[PDB]
């Protein structure tokens, strides 16, 4: 299947209390592989998945240098944003960035991303064509005109289609035993009477990877959306994910309900019935 | 406009400390230090993004240290200089977008065992020959700067109080007067060629001006011969009617 | 790991030739490349920058190409001029850091086209203290090479090109001198092959 590499960075100013805190994390698909935290003692990009520990000392030197440069860049950008928005040096602000690339099953470039948010809102984003910018407000329009005149997008595109894709291909191969593995969900049902005329059926999916999954309850084969209690897919903490869906049913009618489980790691969808 | 470095030239004795300064292009966020010896490419020392020193090489050994305390200007200091430190120290800054490096004119360092061998140039101007004038209707003046050490000179031609460039050729490098001697003094030659009629106007005044980079007025000097300080030595000639 | 190579490392060419200068690098993962020129004793002048997403860049008589996967860049100097004589340096920035990594450079000499050569050896006298003098060998075409003296008390500088711009006239010269008795302009350049028709002014 197709794969993604993503980096997510967060800078948060804290005026009077030193320079902004910068945290960056890198992912391949749903698996984190590196981190950097400007407040941490090491001052190094650090490994967060076993397969990236294969990389030698030059890699860590290189990545540390590059992520620290980003830290400084986003320090600069926080200062500029203050000016663009006419905001005081008193308050704390947040600058986020996401970038990375998608590749198909043969390893070919699919899509690129390069985007910013200021204080939780869209600021500026590279369009899918990787040639054009979307400015979300008047301040970001200043940045957009600056970047258009300087043809900044061309070297951003080069990274997304080049360096990004080559890194992802390398990571996918080095970590193929875990990254290209599929762990299908282990499923079960629970059943709890809540009164003498109603009972809860809860359908569980556990230990699955990747995170994408669909859990659906059907009654007589019909829609149960409004009546389904569904939690957001959540990390187990060991590299896998969990989810459940629950319906309240009339006692004695359990056999009328089916829970449908769809996941990439299943040969065919599962149908569960109490 | 450009990147500015000071001092342009620096001569010192072994064991002395030295400090160079770089003032980058204003809007540039990155500043780089390089070291260069004759015939080689520049070698990387260190660079800054704003005030942060983000990469240094092994050539930035313990005696070498740089800082850029406010962003803006940077300082490179070398402790306990050794003759092996002698080199051109180059500073550059780069644009926010392309990262094109723009270099300063460099700070050229010469470290000596002692200062006893330092000498300013003697300068002579040699006048155009009558036979050149007969043969070509042109007239070549020659300047020789001789006996100087070390090899830090800038030679320029001045005609009637203004510096000239047209018709000038100066040797690219000085030559050694005594190639077999370890601290051989140097010589440098230049030509200025003008039309015969220009030379033949006795109104015309020609000056070969040689800026020598030597000792600071403050350097320790215990020899009876005059302290060989940084100075300008010139020779002059007047056109001749005949 | 990255090695930047510039071969040939020195060139001597006739003026007007359309030139190619070579740069190669062992690691293809470069972000951009920059060409510089450097005159002896001076700093670096930026000439062209080529981004990894560009195949070529142009500025006046200069073009540069880039072929990342082949690890090559070429600097083209159209209609080369004596004023182009300098050392040309190639440098690359890696995807993995911000510094430039430099080649050692190619030294370029562009020889002037001397349309009407007048080779001659003249004696020139010190403006302050004649009887001191030097010997000037001048106006020879760029096919002439000036050798070092057989005598170690005689100094001979290499050929220098001057340009009298508003006359549209260029000339080669070498200077010889010696604080020595047997040294005469007639014999100054005897260790060189000079043109048969070199003008030696009559004895005074």
């Amino acid at each position: 299947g197709s794969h993604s590499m993503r980096y997510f960075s967060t800078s948060v100013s804290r005026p009077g209390r030193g320079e902004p805190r910068f945290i960056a994390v890198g992912y391949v698909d749903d698996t984190q592989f590196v981190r950097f935290d400007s407040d941490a003692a090491s001052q190094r990009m650090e490994p967060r998945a076993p397969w990236i520990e294969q990389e030698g000392p030059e890699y860590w030197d290189e990545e540390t240098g590059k992520v620290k440069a980003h830290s400084q860049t986003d320090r600069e950008n926080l200062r500029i944003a203050l000016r663009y928005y006419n905001q005081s040096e008193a308050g704390s602000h947040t600058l986020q960035m996401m970038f990375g690339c998608d590749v198909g099953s043969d390893g070919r470039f699919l899509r690129g991303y390069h985007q910013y948010a200021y204080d939780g809102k869209d600021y500026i984003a590279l369009k899918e064509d990787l040639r054009s910018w979307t400015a979300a407000d008047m301040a970001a329009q200043i940045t957009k005109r600056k970047w258009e005149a300087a043809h900044v997008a061309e070297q951003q595109r080069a990274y997304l289609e080049g360096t990004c894709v080559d890194g992802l291909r390398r990571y996918l191969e080095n970590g193929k035993e875990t990254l290209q593995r599929t762990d299908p969900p282990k499923t079960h049902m629970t059943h709890h009477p809540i009164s003498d005329h109603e009972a809860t059926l809860r359908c569980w999916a556990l230990g699955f990877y990747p995170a994408e999954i669909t859990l659906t309850w059907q009654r007589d084969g019909e829609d149960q959306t409004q009546d389904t209690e569904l939690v957001e897919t959540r990390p187990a903490g060991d590299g896998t994910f969990q989810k459940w869906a629950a319906v309240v049913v009339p006692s004695g009618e359990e056999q009328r309900y089916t829970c449908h489980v769809q996941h990439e790691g299943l040969p065919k969808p599962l149908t569960l019935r109490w | 406009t450009g990147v500015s470095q000071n001092p342009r030239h620096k001569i010192t004795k072994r064991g002395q400390n030295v400090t160079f300064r770089c003032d980058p292009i204003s809007e540039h966020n990155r500043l780089y230090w390089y070291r260069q010896t004759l015939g080689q490419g520049p070698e990387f020392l260190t660079y800054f993004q704003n005030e942060a020193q983000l990469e240094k090489s092994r050539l930035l050994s313990d005696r070498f240290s740089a800082e850029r305390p406010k962003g803006s200007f940077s300082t490179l200091e070398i402790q306990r200089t050794e003759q092996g430190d002698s080199a051109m120290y180059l500073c550059a800054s780069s644009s926010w977008d392309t990262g094109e490096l723009f270099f300063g004119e460099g700070s050229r360092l010469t470290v000596l065992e002692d200062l006893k061998n330092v000498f300013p140039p003697e300068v002579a101007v040699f006048e155009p020959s009558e036979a050149e004038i007969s043969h070509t209707q042109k007239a070549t003046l020659v300047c020789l700067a001789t006996g100087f050490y070390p090899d830090h000179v800038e030679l320029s031609w001045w005609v009637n109080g203004k510096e000239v460039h047209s018709g000038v050729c100066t040797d690219p490098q000085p030559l050694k007067e005594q190639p077999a001697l370890n601290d051989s003094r140097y010589a440098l030659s230049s030509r200025l060629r003008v039309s015969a009629t220009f030379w033949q106007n006795p109104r015309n005044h020609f000056r070969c001006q040689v800026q020598f980079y030597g000792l600071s007025e403050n350097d320790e000097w215990t020899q009876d011969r005059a302290k060989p300080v940084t100075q300008i030595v010139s020779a002059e000639a007047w056109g001749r009617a005949d | 790991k990255q090695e930047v190579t510039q071969i040939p490392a020195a060139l001597s060419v006739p003026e007007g030739e359309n030139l190619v200068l070579n740069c190669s690098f062992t690691d293809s993962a470069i972000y951009n490349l920059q060409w510089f020129r450097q005159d002896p004793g001076k700093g670096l002048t930026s000439l062209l920058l080529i981004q990894s997403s560009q195949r070529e860049q142009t500025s006046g008589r200069l073009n540069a190409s880039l072929d990342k996967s082949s690890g090559r860049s070429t600097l083209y100097i159209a209609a080369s001029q004596p004023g182009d004589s300098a050392t040309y340096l190639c440098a690359v920035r890696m995807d993995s850091s911000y510094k430039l990594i430099f080649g050692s450079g190619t030294r370029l000499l562009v020889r002037p086209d001397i349309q009407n050569p007048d080779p001659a050896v003249y004696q020139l006298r010190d403006s302050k203290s004649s009887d001191k003098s030097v010997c000037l060998f001048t106006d020879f075409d760029s096919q002439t090479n000036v050798s070092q003296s057989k005598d170690s008390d005689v100094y001979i500088t290499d050929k220098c090109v001057l340009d009298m711009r508003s006359m549209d006239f260029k000339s080669n010269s070498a200077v010889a001198w010696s604080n020595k008795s047997d040294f005469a302009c007639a014999n100054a350049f005897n260790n060189s092959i000079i043109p048969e028709d070199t003008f030696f002014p009559s004895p005074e």
């Binding site: 990545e63 950008n77 500029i80 900044v152 070297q155 360096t163 | 977008d97 | -």
Partner: peptide, 10 residues
């Protein structure tokens, strides 16, 4: 593999 930040200035 991290990008360079040339061109990222607001």
């Amino acid at each position: 593999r991290y990008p360079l930040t040339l061109g990222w200035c607001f």
